[PDB]
Amino acid sequence: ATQGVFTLPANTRFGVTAFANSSGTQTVNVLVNNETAATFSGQSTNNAVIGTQVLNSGSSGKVQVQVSVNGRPSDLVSAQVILTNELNFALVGSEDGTDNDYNDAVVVINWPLG
Amino acid sequence: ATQGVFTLPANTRFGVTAFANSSGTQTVNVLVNNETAATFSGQSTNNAVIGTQVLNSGSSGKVQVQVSVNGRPSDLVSAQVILTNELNFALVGSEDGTDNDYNDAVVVINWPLG
Amino acid sequence: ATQGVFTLPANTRFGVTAFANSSGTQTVNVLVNNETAATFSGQSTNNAVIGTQVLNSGSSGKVQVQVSVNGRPSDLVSAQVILTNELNFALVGSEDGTDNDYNDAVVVINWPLG
Amino acid sequence: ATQGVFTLPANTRFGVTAFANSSGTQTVNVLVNNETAATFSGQSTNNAVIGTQVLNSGSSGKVQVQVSVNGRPSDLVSAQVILTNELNFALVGSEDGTDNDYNDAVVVINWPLG
Ligand SMILES: [C]OC(=O)C1=N[N]N([C]2O[C]([C][O])[C](O[C]3O[C]([C])[C]([O])[C]([O])[C]3[O])[C]([O])[C]2[N]C([C])=O)=[C]1
Ligand SMILES: [C]OC(=O)C1=N[N]N([C]2O[C]([C][O])[C](O[C]3O[C]([C])[C]([O])[C]([O])[C]3[O])[C]([O])[C]2[N]C([C])=O)=[C]1
Ligand SMILES: [C]OC(=O)C1=N[N]N([C]2O[C]([C][O])[C](O[C]3O[C]([C])[C]([O])[C]([O])[C]3[O])[C]([O])[C]2[N]C([C])=O)=[C]1
Ligand SMILES: C[C@@H]1O[C@@H](O)[C@@H](O)[C@H](O)[C@@H]1O
Ligand SMILES: [Ca+2]
Ligand SMILES: [Ca+2]
Ligand SMILES: [Ca+2]
Ligand SMILES: [Ca+2]
Ligand SMILES: [Ca+2]
Ligand SMILES: [Ca+2]
Ligand SMILES: [Ca+2]
Ligand SMILES: [Ca+2]
């Protein structure tokens, strides 16, 4: 199944934050309406924050996370969770190798803000 | 029900990251085995990362998040989600007022690392 | 924090199914737009299905689950989880006593149907 | 990533319940420690509860859900969510065709029981 794709409420600000846990340099692209809206990159084996930004979901609300390492897309896993019918998390893990820890880039999207 | 309390695997590193979305200064305390192990404070209405840290869950695995604004405890919500039977997120929202957006401090705990 | 309240897309059919795990008889009420739409009753300590039904979320999309045991409101826990940006679960547990297993009535709402 | 595989508490009873939403007849197989422990089947476009059973997770706790329609494996999506650090849901969706509603067989595993 498709992973890393989320429909947010239209025209809504959201946070996006990426963490790295791998030998390899992670590039995380955040798409809004099928165009790149932000790109983060970095390398850490200690969960460093490699980027964080506030974006608008735009007219369609379609947000997609893609991760590439060493020139190839990582395999993604994702889900959305909503707490007390108010607080939204869109969560992404990714695997760049063979160990299947799925933490090589971890991406957290949260909304609403403010 | 109790919120903001999670049992992690023992002696395991985890990440903890706090975001703020309120006019009030947030104080986030992260307790491991009932003792404060990290503290973050700050004011943002735009999802600032008021702190991120790597901690060790220690012998007990017990991790608790508390949030307050100038000493008044915020009301918490929380849950844990596991992706592909491997990747863990422990999620906390908090409310410091009456609007019930539950984003006033947001805390994400993730493991494994590395 | 309020629990057991979910906003569904408007005018959408959804399933609601309840299970019991308690010596007490569980009564589960399901409200749509603040009006009772289904009621299930039963007793089991073996996870029996005490009711299942299909409802429509109507113009507001507001769905609420309440649980009581001999008229005493149970404390609730809840969350919503969306897989592949398509499949929705609204999940409720409830506690009628002191052991805090929160399984005394378990309610699963799922959509879309069909 | 692998989907539909969950590590449960060892030696512990859990509920497993399947719902159908497709023109195709669903077959759901539940494996405990790699051996078939339950099979459910039916055909509904209105969320029929085609099976529900209590199983024991056995010595290893490994539980796997597979879904097929007329002998062809469906694509699976899954996650586990934990409420108040104790109430667990392992969730599976599946797709037998091209519309990507992932509801064609829906499986919910819940524990603890009793
Ligand atoms: C006098 O005293 C004081 O200072 C005050 N008053 N009122 N207030 C309020 O509070 C609240 C709670 O905290 C707040 O809210 C917050 O923030 C906002 C922005 C949002 O975010 C929400 O959500 C939160 O909760 C408000 O703001 C305030 N107001 C004013 C006017 O300040 C305080
Ligand atoms: C006379 O009075 C009466 O009835 C009583 N007492 N006590 N009790 C109790 O309660 C409780 C609460 O509800 C119960 O718990 C329940 O169930 C069980 C089995 C389990 O499940 C739990 O979790 C729940 O919560 C109990 O059982 C009882 N006990 C007796 C002996 O009965 C009542
Ligand atoms: C002749 O051939 C046959 O058999 C067929 N064709 N087409 N089909 C289709 O398929 C599909 C897949 O499976 C189906 O889908 C299902 O169901 C529906 C109702 C819904 O639920 C969905 O989601 C699912 O997936 C369809 O139905 C069909 N169509 C017709 C018309 O049949 C088969
Ligand atoms: C240090 C290692 O780097 C890459 O091989 C990752 O895929 C592994 O998960 C691990 O983080
Ligand atoms: Ca890896
Ligand atoms: Ca890694
Ligand atoms: Ca607030
Ligand atoms: Ca706020
Ligand atoms: Ca109980
Ligand atoms: Ca019980
Ligand atoms: Ca389908
Ligand atoms: Ca279907």
Structure in words:
4 copies of one chain form a homotetramer. Chain A has 114 residues and is mainly beta. Chain A has one domain: Jelly Rolls (Sandwich), CATH 2.60.120.400. In chain A, 0% of the residues lie in helices and 61% in strands. Chain A has strands at 5-7, 13-20, 26-32, 35-42, 48-56, 62-69, 72-73, 75-83, 87-95, 105-111. In chain A, strands 1, 3, 4, 6 and 7 form a 5-stranded antiparallel β-sheet that branches. In chain A, strands 5-2-10-9-8 form a 5-stranded antiparallel β-sheet, with no helix packed on it. Chains A and C meet through strand 1 and strand 8 of A and strand 1 and strand 6 of C. Strand 8 of chain A pairs antiparallel with strand 6 (75-83) of chain C. One calcium ion (CA) binds next to strand 2 of chain B. Chains A, B, C, D: Ca(2+) 1 binds at residues 21, 99, 101, 103-104, 114. Chains A, B, C, D: Ca(2+) 3 binds at residue 114. Chains A, B, C, D: One of its GO terms (biological process) is single-species biofilm formation.
